[PDB]
Design a protein around this ligand. Structure first.
Ligand SMILES: [Cl-]
Lengths: 308, 308, 308, 308, 308
């Protein structure tokens, strides 16, 4: 008894990912098909009804169900819409849409994070004994030039009709609380190039160069230099944080920078220890030289151990 | 004989906290139920009226009352609208909404502050002798993925029907100036992760290592380093302020920064005092070693007394 | 013959002050009452007419005058509208509004500036001989938690009905050119808290500590150090401008910084004067030392004459 | 045969200049008068028709021509609309508008440049043989206190009706092209204070103080300091670039900053030259002796010759 | 049988390129002509129908086809709409539009890149057997070699009408799946002036002067100074990236900056290598000296290689 609705979603563009709000933008078309009481049309050719006229057809009692994007954020921008009314009953609703969609997004493995962009589609008023999603086709384009793009869409889209039971309701009438829901997934990974060459690498070099504090001859030389290195790291945290996506947690990159702060606070604790370890506050030429490429080892070891 | 209206608010998303405007974004549905004169429907099955058609029904004199979000800021984004008209008299209005809401918000304990997100719902035109909130249900989803999220939602929602007396009204007759008001509350706390490891921690280290000025042997060495340290805290002041939420008052982190400014202006008053102290204006290297761990203590103590 | 219109303006929130545009955001309700030809209502109870239906009443020639916010910037966001039609002739228009309003704003005494938020309300089409503002009430909230707020509202609201002469006319009889105008004022001052503790104070310390250049023994030490001080004032100027409101003129803080640039450029001229003033390249260790409290005096004085 | 249309444009506010789009915001009223079919009005008094009602008269076939702002950017925000319909034929359209307008803008002499704010107005559908602009008045406020304002208006507004020939139009249909176009101009100059005192001045001082490197006695002193001076200019370029309006070409300031870079790269080339010119690798303190006031001239000379 | 539609697109302004979204803004008019049912108009003079009225005519069964900008992002801002209805059947739709358009954009050769601005137009509902694009005229402004302008256009617009075969939908004899599509291209090149003089040039000077590290006398001098140069490169990356367009890949300039990090990290690996190679812990000043303008070749040569 429920109406069978066949859905097709064409996806043109996924862009404008907002990390903090955990949202992304989607431009595409949506197509919905169902069959009803047949109709006498001009000619026996199908009838086309564009935009403002659909309202009039609905006002004279044409059945056009809602279909709401569950995970949209604010009313999406709908472009031109179309009704194609067939004489043998059918009907097809075709409309373009631009919307901001929500999903959980874990950006902790940044800049090597994998995300999946999702659309969820569900009738607004009609349960599965009134309206049912029969099948979902999903269409995406084949991106020829990938570096142009920030994200690489890795796979064809996964689709799945399913059924949603709403437990807190108006009247239960025990079979009127389940809804048909299309769910669409598109997996993707971040193009990690720019973030490697322009942030990760320089932070490496600078962190390396921090260790060369030890190869200064004087103690005064070594300790005063640490303060300039300290500053370089502050400047660097400022650089990354101002240009990298804002988040509520530490990334790979954020960790490197805290490491940088420590390697420098560490050396300062040693550089100053050397100068008082032995009696006669003689600078301690034995301990330092070892640190010179022990640190580049010890940091390169206990720093090599995060896979969280 | 006031009309009893039963309200249910499903809440999907709280996001977009604006610290300075003291606002937040809320996505959800709102449901309102009431009973009126019974009705002739197609079949004896209830009638559904979606979006554009509700307006037409209102035009034939269907009572669909206002209901205003008292604390919304600007007309909220309304998604789909639905009326369910039952034959047995009653009526259910179901709508999706995205709005920017206002509440008082104290950000002084940042990044360890707790807040409560609030909705206030009240009829726009009809008082409690005409329209009364019978009961308010509020539903939230439960959160497994919490680190992902910026805020931590504590407990399920507090609800509140009450009556508001408006003293300034034209045809007052003071038994017609009281309005029925739902009020919903959601407590939440800030996820202090990012702010601890990436701001609080390094600022300690920087303030710490600032103290290591005293272990420089020369005076020229100590004073010249002090100006570089000064610069570093400024660089840090810029770093935090550019990334932390703007507020009209100082947070914890801002005070740490003023502290760093103090510890360093302090040492400069000493580092230069030593250079003249007792008789024979001696290069009194004696104060400095006291200082080496005198006001890493004197600071970590006189700073230990912030309890606002 | 002129219509008497009684206005009440409830003010909920004054926020979002934009310095450069000289504007601010105002959320509130507006109420207008005027009385006309008596009327048949259902019962002898008043008729309430919400939102979309007002249009219908206006089409059948219900007189609802304009009322324009003279000093708004763009058509305001209007929430719900309401007509209360009384049987005994009278009529009340009640609507919620959010708007961006313009007034003159002098930010020179920042962050110790005083401003006044203003609404100006005027009939759009009907002059003072057709439509007249009889009286104006303005209602505001009681601000209990004052630091929470960026601005402190100091006073209850000032109101003023008046008459405006428009110099240009296309209707004959030159006495059809004056309009009734409600005018409302609200004075307020900026919470100078954040700005003293996070900018002014360190700017003192930073400016002060620049003077400790003179307590350096060498000339090499003194001149090379001043270049580092220079960099600090620059980095600090960068800090302020990025975080302070952007403007087209100098505030105090902007000036302190320029002085700061001078305090350092001067010092550089002495440090270099001393070192070549006297004969036989004898150092003029007297100028330095005379300076030790000439500058901390001459500057903490020559800045005291910013009494504008 | 054509209708004569008399226009008046009241200008309230010119604000919100966007340099890169080369646009600006204009708030004002527009008034159009023309005479048509005489009419049966209530009374022999003119009839006022506001907002929603104007559309209705147009549906009964009232001629209300378009009028388009040629140089606007996107549909302007139109506030209240008014028709004053006189019985003696004539017709007045009065509307408030806020719009973003585009004009060519040359910012090379920034911050000492003059600009002219412009409106261009032309009917959307009707040529000059159907609709003709008879005459154009423009009304602007006098402006009380000028620095409050970012821009200073140098002149009363220029007006100019003209006729524009469109070469590719309708059919061929010769001689029914050409459109009546009002054009309004307002010249203005930038309030150049802020940019002198907070940018030009300190950059001079920074550049000046750079020259005092030559007065360092050692070579090590002079060369190592230059790298600090370098850093200062980078820091300064960043201060300016982040805070000044963005453009696609170099301004005055942008050039001064390139100068600062060269003046230092030059100095690095000299400072290191002296140190190798003479025999027995003696420092060539004779050259650096000369430079101390060669640069303040040589820079202020071949750098003075900026007259672009 | 299909209707021939002749399109003319006037382009006023291409602006607001968004690098990250790969979009650009286009302001212009669009005109479409086709011939239909002959018609009785007032006089035998053609009839004009503006804005709101078009909707009326469409309701009495006037055919005004969709026409969608295929590569637009969101419903574009449509200004005034116009129908010109001719007595001999034909019909012209003239409308103004401001829209945000999408194309693939490769910014890797920035700031020396060439891009092509694109419009794509296609009927929304009607295939090529119903509606056919006869021809596309494009009109653009002629202004030439212009600095006010950010871009240099390389030619008048190139166009291409075609037929697009859609693999998916309910087809009659499958030739009802092809659509007529206008396509417009405008090539343009980035004017690299600003970017050479204000970024490339100083980055050169800075990289150069980094080499004068080798010409420092001491080893302490050489190693301590390079840490300052490092800082400078860091300060510069922050400068460039904060003001240059955001992208997901490295540009020319980005590479130059990575080079600077290398030029300095290399030097540090050397400055410290020289100082330990030989027996008799001898200073190794030949190898240094050789490096002094070995780098300036070594860099200015193999960096002079890139041809991507
Ligand atoms: Cl539950």
């Amino acid at each position: 008894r429920p109406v069978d609705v066949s859905v097709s979603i064409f996806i043109n563009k996924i862009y404008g990912v907002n990390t903090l709000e955990q949202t992304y933008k989607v431009d595409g078309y949506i197509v919905a098909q169902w069959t009803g009481k047949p109709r006498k049309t001009p000619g026996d050719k199908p009838l086309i009804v564009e935009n403002t006229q659909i309202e009039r057809w609905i006002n004279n009692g044409l059945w056009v169900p809602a279909l709401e994007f569950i995970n949209v954020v604010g009313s999406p921008d709908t472009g031109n819409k179309r009704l194609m009314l067939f004489p043998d009953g059918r009907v097809i609703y075709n409309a373009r849409f631009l919307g901001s969609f929500s999903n959980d997004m874990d950006f902790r493995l940044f800049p090597f994070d994998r995300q999946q962009f999702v659309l969820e589609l569900e009738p607004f008023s009609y349960n599965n004994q009134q309206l049912r999603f029969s099948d979902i086709q999903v269409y995406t384009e084949n991106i020829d030039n990938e570096e142009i793009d920030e994200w690489w869409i890795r796979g064809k889209a996964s689709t799945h009709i399913s059924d949603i039971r709403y437990d807190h309701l108006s009247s239960v009438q025990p079979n009127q609380n389940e809804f048909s829901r299309i769910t669409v997934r598109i997996d993707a990974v971040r193009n990690p190039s720019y973030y490697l060459w322009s942030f990760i690498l320089p932070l490496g070099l600078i962190i390396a160069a921090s260790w060369s504090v030890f190869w200064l001859e004087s103690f005064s030389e070594r300790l005063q230099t640490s303060f300039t290195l300290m500053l370089t790291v502050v400047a660097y945290a400022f650089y990354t944080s101002n240009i990298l996506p804002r988040l509520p947690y530490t990334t790979v990159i954020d960790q490197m920078i805290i490491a940088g702060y420590g390697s420098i606070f560490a050396a300062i604790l040693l550089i100053i220890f050397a100068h008082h370890r032995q009696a006669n506050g003689v600078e301690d030429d034995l301990l330092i030289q070892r640190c010179r490429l022990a640190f580049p080892l010890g940091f390169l070891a206990i720093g090599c151990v995060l896979v969280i």
